[PDB]
Design a protein around this ligand. Sequence first.
Ligand SMILES: CCCCCC(=O)OC[C@H](COP(=O)([O-])OCCN)OC(=O)CCCCC
Lengths: 105, 425, 55, 446, 34, 34
Amino acid sequence: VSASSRWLEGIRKWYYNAAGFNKLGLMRDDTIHENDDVKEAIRRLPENLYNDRVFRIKRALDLSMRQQILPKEQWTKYEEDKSYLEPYLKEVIRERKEREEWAKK
Amino acid sequence: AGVPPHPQDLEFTRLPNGLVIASLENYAPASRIGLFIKAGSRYENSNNLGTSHLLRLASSLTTKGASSFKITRGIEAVGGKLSVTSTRENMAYTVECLRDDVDILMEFLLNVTTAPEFRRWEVAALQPQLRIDKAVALQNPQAHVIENLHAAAYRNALANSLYCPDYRIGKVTPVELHDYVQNHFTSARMALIGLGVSHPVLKQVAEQFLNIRGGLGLSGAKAKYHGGEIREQNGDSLVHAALVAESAAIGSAEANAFSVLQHVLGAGPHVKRGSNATSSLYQAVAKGVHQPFDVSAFNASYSDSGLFGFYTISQAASAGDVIKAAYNQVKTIAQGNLSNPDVQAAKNKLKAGYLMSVESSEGFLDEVGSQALAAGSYTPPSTVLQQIDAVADADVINAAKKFVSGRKSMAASGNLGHTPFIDEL
Amino acid sequence: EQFLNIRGGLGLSGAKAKYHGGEIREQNGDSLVHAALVAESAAIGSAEANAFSVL
Amino acid sequence: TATYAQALQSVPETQVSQLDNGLRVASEQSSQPTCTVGVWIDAGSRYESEKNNGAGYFVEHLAFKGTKNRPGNALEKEVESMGAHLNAYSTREHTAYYIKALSKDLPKAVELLADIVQNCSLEDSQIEKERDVILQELQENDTSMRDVVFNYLHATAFQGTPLAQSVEGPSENVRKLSRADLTEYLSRHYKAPRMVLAAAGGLEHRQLLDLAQKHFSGLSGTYDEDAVPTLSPCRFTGSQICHREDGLPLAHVAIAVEGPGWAHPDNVALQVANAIIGHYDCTYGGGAHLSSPLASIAATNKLCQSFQTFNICYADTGLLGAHFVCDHMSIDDMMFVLQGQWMRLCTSATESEVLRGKNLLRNALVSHLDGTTPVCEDIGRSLLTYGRRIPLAEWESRIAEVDARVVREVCSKYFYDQCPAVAGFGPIEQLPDYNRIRSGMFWLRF
Amino acid sequence: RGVAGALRDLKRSVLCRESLRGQAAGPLVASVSL
Amino acid sequence: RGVAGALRDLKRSVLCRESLRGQAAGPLVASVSL
Ligand SMILES: CCCCCC(=O)OC[C@H](COP(=O)([O-])OCCN)OC(=O)CCCCC
């Protein structure tokens, strides 16, 4: 909407490229630490996203073993990073918080 | 003095969109509500068999106004109940609780029926329940006989099983459940019934939350009687068998003649461990059979068809003898050998049985709910008994004539070495 | 003569197969419909069976 | 509209009268065209000796098979022709015969009940018929693992006492019970003060009392020549019985402690506790999300096909506990979770879950007394046990008293550090040893 | 508890003629609960 | 290897009309071996 919230994105694009998981062809949600909430969200993914997530992670563990990265052409662009897991994950948390609010009635 | 108060009258309303509301205020401590829908298994086709069964198991799944967790915990906190009963014609979503908590359970009932989400994973976790639920039901040999009996009798619609075919378990999709509720949970197909609730509340609820259009108009997918037979050779110790012919659709006067004919022949025992002295079929079979058996008239009446006949249980070797003895006893009635005191006695049993079946709230709500869907009206019991009294002895005879001469349907299971086919009767 | 001279049991029983007609319908989830339609024809060896083979 | 409290006042009070000979006549009027009337009797296996055990069950087979004024099948014909239904049952303490019929058929129905009790034919040829019938029924019962394991619970828990006996009696007694044994049982136990003529439906209490004075005047007077059955107390024994049978697909377990009795106010609070634990089987819909931890865990981890809590009451005693059905490798886990919930309610019950258990009992009570038959049953039974009808308004008051402190005090009184009775049947190799079971009845942390 | 009615774990066997009355069917119904 | 003939592990699918000829039955036989 403005120029101030636009360099805010510029420093988030900066941190994104510095974090460097896009150099392994990975997306932000591929790097989330699996807890009980996350393991449930992954369980709920449709077959296409689950299989894609499996291969991207497998491709990255392969690269990490060789201490290599993908060509710059194949890095995950900050603009094209689909937060595919947070919708499922946010509903998992929402359900858990409901149980927790009932548990103290 | 110890007397009951002025019994209020049932109130009844038809909205222009087709929805029906019926309420009664018995001032009872508990309240019961039911949403009866013309969505039984007859409305499945051969590309989505079993959808109405899985739908019947999915009332506690997640809706738009209530998580799966909230439905279960909300109802249990109040000690209430949520049930789903299914006929080949109707599904009936019933709710029970104390009258102070009707607000809560109505909200749950509406979310189940109006706002199910059918989430891909919840549905997926539920498919194994079909196998368990069907396995429990088929522990009764009667269950598979009746299912096979309808599959042999009809080409479509009423041929469909209440229970999901084995090949469909795991394959019923969330889309099919969505389409099924869209096509069949329509205002024109619904009835909202309530005990211990006032009529203005139900009407308000109905106008605000149960005005759903579209889907499928009351389809003329007429059940086509066919006749046939299905024979299940298994290792049961006894042979169960049923023999029927097309009879009469419910509501018509011919159906009352069939109901009376049922109680002439013998529907069930009235005394514990009795010989059933006034059961025509039992005494007919018992003369030439001195081994354990059972026999009963079978009467099933549907919106556009019906099946009438008898049901037999016997030793595998006495199968045909029991069948043929039962059949000849019906032939006797078709030949006009029927006394008038026997009809007045059958009209006594049927009248007494009907009133007994509506003593409780659960039986009363079911009759009102199914009356509303089948007939679009409510018929008090004094008028029912009048319609029973109007049955003449010749009507009963003609009903037995229609059975003898009509194309038959047979289902039998057991060791069928001595169980006749149709053409051997 | 030495090892296959077994008597008794059942003589060539006249438990004649009784044709009846009927139909059995198995609703499943195969992609195609398989179907067979037949009528009683002729016992093997008779000349009518050769006509059926030719047909 | 009317509230729940206001609806409980709107029930008609059961009108109660007593005849001159001892018989008690009780009715709850409604606006129904149908009704049920029946005779409830203080009789059962607990009153029988080992030498005539099973007699009253023999009588049940013969009650409907003939009488002096209506010999043979004449009694079946009369009730079937007026569309009525006739039934009976026998527990270890109570015996009942009742009819369902039209309200206009009440005077004939009362007449038949009177003729059944007083004037029974008991032809020696009918007895020999009913003898082979009972033996077959015994072979049938042997296949109901549920009915077996509860007869085993009674057998071990009340060993050495009349309550240990089954209702049906042993096969040996059936084969030698004579007509003299049966008439002795009837003449002793079927006396007017120990009977109640209960009715429920559309009927004025005046009418029922008139018929009682007409058709039940011939009963034996108040005195009985000094030979009254006085029920002695029945010793409860902490004990265990295991019937190992690995050929059966599923194991049945029943476990219980001694309960107080019929007229003890503790039963209310105990029923609230049993409702928290609740019941379950594999066809329920809730599964993981059920309130009861036992239910939720059993569905999630698939520890059983079904379980149910119970509070079986008798005079000055009872059986309080649970029963379940599971795979042979799940018995230990089921008993662990079961006992853990008993211990948890003894020591740390919370107010919220007790409100749920209270509401579950409220719902269970109202909906059970729905129809003419269950009201007439509650009339008849309640006068043999409490000596009066307890209105629903009182039951609600005895419930609202219950809070979390009440269930903890009441449960500890009966559950905590008490010797249970155990009964097992089926593939029960994994059934925990009795010392391990006994150690599950307390917590070292408490 | 699930229900199936139609009259108007090894379960249990039936042998005699008195316990067999009431078994013959007389239209099926399928019910489900919580 | 066990055999079933009648023409006179996921197996494999048939889609076209050329691979479908030869499938229609033409009396069954059941054979067993070592
Ligand atoms: C410092 C205190 C340590 C306490 C150990 C303990 O109590 O172990 C359990 C048993 C008795 O409890 P339980 O078996 O009845 O179970 C009760 C279940 N609620 O006691 C013994 O027999 C164990 C012997 C240990 C020897 C090294």
